[PDB]
Amino acid sequence: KNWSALLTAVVIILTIAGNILVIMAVSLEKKLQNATNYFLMSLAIADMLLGFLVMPVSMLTILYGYRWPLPSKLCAVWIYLDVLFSTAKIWHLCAISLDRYVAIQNPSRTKAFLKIIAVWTISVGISMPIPVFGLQDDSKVFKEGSCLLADDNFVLIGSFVSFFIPLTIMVITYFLTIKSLQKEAADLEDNWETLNDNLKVIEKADNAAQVKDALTKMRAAALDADILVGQIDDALKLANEGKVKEAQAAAEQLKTTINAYIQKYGQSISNEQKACKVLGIVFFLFVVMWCPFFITNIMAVICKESCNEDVIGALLNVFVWIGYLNSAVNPLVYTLFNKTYRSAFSRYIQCQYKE
Ligand SMILES: O=C(CCCN1CCN2c3cccc4[nH]cc(c34)C[C@@H]2C1)c1ccc(F)cc1
Ligand SMILES: [Mg+2]
């Protein structure tokens, strides 16, 4: 036996215990019902299934010295589900990254479920050559009787199509979301300045022209950022007919609507930027905990006869469990950085499920 098998059992349990709680948070808690949290439930389904189906079999092969213990046609099915769940996880993290970017310049639950299912079928068919060709040829899924994807052309093209190019789309759209929110925070500090400057011009004004000019540029700023434009227009026609102090008074009625609207839109930018940061920790620890696998497995293919394929193959049996450990940690990120997730799990650990 191995103490490694003991450590893996913990990693199976943390994966199964943590991700069920994530599925229980998103299914039960009303504050986790947006589209991103629907993807994080679907991601936790991929994590829960990897802990149930893939990760205990990988522990079983640790116990048999990576000689495959099961039926030989269960190898390509096991590598298919292994590659499927993780490929779903990267295309999920890519879909979160992309859909938060598009949600800024397009301002349903069903729409989430069309996207999730599109990401699942993309992953079902990208991973489809593993049972199609590996069940017809044991040399694609076996190496010295070790079940592992043995064809280098599957490992090169599977890493490029299902790990490199979703990570590339992920890291672009994350950088562009970060810049979009920084422009949106800067656009609304700018319109806050144009509103607050013209409100102070109106409260100094002796003549109708200075109220009318300052409300015109207030009507411009509000149009750029919602329905207080009409209130600004109501005050615009008060200034237009010489009623200076009555237009000045109605701009003070603007100052209460402005502070409400600015602060509400200014809280949702810091909601978005908080949420972008938590997703970026999720994105980061996916790639970092799978980087030692993929880079070794491509340095496997580059120095093939040169390097020790039994050392490389032993590193990859360890590096696969760095990436399996990632399945457990997306729930831990949600405890640390989202009070709604931290509270939901808290209540479920106390067996308290009533909303
Ligand atoms: O496909 C995956 C997970 C890889 C993990 N699989 C585990 C089973 N088995 C191996 C075990 C031990 C050594 C091994 N060398 C080669 C392989 C292998 C093949 C195969 C790989 C994936 C896909 C997209 C992502 F974004 C992130 C991970
Ligand atoms: Mg100013």
UniProtKB/Swiss-Prot annotation:
It is found in: Cell membrane; Cell projection, Dendrite; Cell projection, Axon; Cytoplasmic vesicle. GO terms for cellular component: axon; caveola; cell body fiber; cytoplasmic vesicle; dendrite; dendritic shaft; G protein-coupled serotonin receptor complex; glutamatergic synapse. Residues 65-73, 136-152, 303-310 are extracellular. Binds lysergic acid diethylamine (LSD) in the orthosteric pocket. Bound LSD dissociates extremely slowly, with a residence time of about 221 minutes at 37 degrees Celsius. The gene is HTR2A. G-protein coupled receptor for 5-hydroxytryptamine (serotonin). Also functions as a receptor for various drugs and psychoactive substances, including mescaline, psilocybin, 1-(2,5-dimethoxy-4-iodophenyl)-2-aminopropane (DOI) and lysergic acid diethylamide (LSD). Ligand binding causes a conformation change that triggers signaling via guanine nucleotide-binding proteins (G proteins) and modulates the activity of downstream effectors. This is 5-hydroxytryptamine receptor 2A. Its main location: membrane.
